[PDB]
Amino acid sequence: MEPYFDPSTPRNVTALMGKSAYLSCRVRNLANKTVSWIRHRDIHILTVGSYTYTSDQRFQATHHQDTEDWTLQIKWAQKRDAGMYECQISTQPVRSYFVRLNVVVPH
Amino acid sequence: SRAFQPEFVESISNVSVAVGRDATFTCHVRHLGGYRVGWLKADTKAIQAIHENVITHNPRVTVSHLDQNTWNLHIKAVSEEDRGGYMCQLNTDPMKSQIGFLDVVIPPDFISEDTSSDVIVPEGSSVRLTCRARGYPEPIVTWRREDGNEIVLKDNVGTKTLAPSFRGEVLKLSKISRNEMGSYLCIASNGVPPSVSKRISLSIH
Ligand SMILES: *[C@@H]1O[C@H](CO)[C@@H](O)[C@H](O)[C@H]1NC(C)=O
Ligand SMILES: *[C@@H]1O[C@H](CO)[C@@H](O)[C@H](O)[C@H]1NC(C)=O
Numbered sequence: 001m002e003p004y005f006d007p008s009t010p011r012n013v014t015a016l017m018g019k020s021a022y023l024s025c026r027v028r029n030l031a032n033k034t035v036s037w038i039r040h041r042d043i044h045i046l047t048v049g050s051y052t053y054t055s056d057q058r059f060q061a062t063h064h065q066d067t068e069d070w071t072l073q074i075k076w077a078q079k080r081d082a083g084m085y086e087c088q089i090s091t092q093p094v095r096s097y098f099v100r101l102n103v104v105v106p107h
Numbered sequence: 108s109r110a111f112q113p114e115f116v117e118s119i120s121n122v123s124v125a126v127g128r129d130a131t132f133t134c135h136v137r138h139l140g141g142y143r144v145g146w147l148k149a150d151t152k153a154i155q156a157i158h159e160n161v162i163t164h165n166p167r168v169t170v171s172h173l174d175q176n177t178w179n180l181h182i183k184a185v186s187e188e189d190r191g192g193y194m195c196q197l198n199t200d201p202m203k204s205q206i207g208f209l210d211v212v213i214p215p216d217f218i219s220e221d222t223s224s225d226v227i228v229p230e231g232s233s234v235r236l237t238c239r240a241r242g243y244p245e246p247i248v249t250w251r252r253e254d255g256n257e258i259v260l261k262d263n264v265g266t267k268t269l270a271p272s273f274r275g276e277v278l279k280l281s282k283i284s285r286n287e288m289g290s291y292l293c294i295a296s297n298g299v300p301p302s303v304s305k306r307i308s309l310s311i312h
């Protein structure tokens with residue numbers, strides 16, 4: 001069967017400025033496809049699997065094997081980082097799962 | 108290895124090819140160094156490839172580079188769904204990108220369901236000769252007598268027009284005389300080879 005996204009994967013994430021942001025992406029039946037993170041505002045490829053494409057060293061994707069979660073971490077989150085992000089499975093055609101990040105200040 | 112980032116040398120050329128032919132997009136860079144050329148489809152954001160690794164499971168998509176300045180994306184046997192913009196991207200900070208566009212044209216091809224067969228009709232009758240065609244851009248149909256004589260177009264009010272060709276999918280012949288019997292050719296053309304032509308015999312008794 002073809003891969004798919006866990007629909008429980010949160011579509012709306014809120015991080016704290018200066019802290020790390022975490023965008024989860026749970027995938028089932030990945031097989032030999034890859035899970036990639038894309039930033040929408042400039043269509044910048046961030047990560048492909050555990051590989052990091054962006055030169056912004058704040059980014060890292062981690063494969064959580066126990067939950068099959070391809071989590072994106074954004075260190076030193078800034079207001080500029082807020083907006084829309086895409087988790088993308090390399091099927092043909094691709095599967096996409098949209099996640100919005102919010103960056104706020106405590107209280 | 109020192110700090111000055113790569114640059115695009117020239118834009119991505121727009122590409123226009125017919126279904127089943129091969130398309131290549133090229134990204135011309137300078138001083139690429141250790142940065143990597145990425146490719147993706149702009150409209151779907153589908154990642155195609157990074158450096159020499161094809162990421163899409165589309166078997167028709169591959170990559171190559173002529174040299175360290177000339178990075179290619181190859182789309183083999185193009186299809187209608189490959190139509191769109193293809194983004195070349197460098198993992199500099201901040202990122203730099205260029206887009207080229209692929210247009211997928213289709214050569215003319217008749218629709219057998221609504222193209223006329225050979226017909227035998229009484230003198231003085233009216234006949235619709237039809238050749239419907241499909242393709243992109245939309246094909247135009249041209250009618251000609253195979254023997255080079257003129258097609259006779261008439262109105263209800265008693266006037267006839269003699270043209271060596273008639274443009275239109277439906278050739279309407281009315282109050283036909285024996286002089287109009289013969290072989291009619293409809294040619295569907297849209298600039299995308301090959302053109303298609305059907306031969307229709309009109310018999311008038
Ligand atoms: C996303 O979360 C923020 C903070 O919790 C909230 O203000 C916003 O309304 C949420 N967006 C949607 C579409 O629910
Ligand atoms: C992924 O697995 C399928 C299984 O049929 C195979 O055909 C395909 O070539 C594989 N792709 C890669 C990149 O290994």
Ligand SMILES: *[C@@H]1O[C@H](CO)[C@@H](O)[C@H](O)[C@H]1NC(C)=O
Pocket residue numbers: 118119120121208
């Ligand atoms: C390619 O074609 C598109 C229209 O589909 C046009 O908007 C664009 O400017 C063209 N690009 C170049 C480099 O000619």
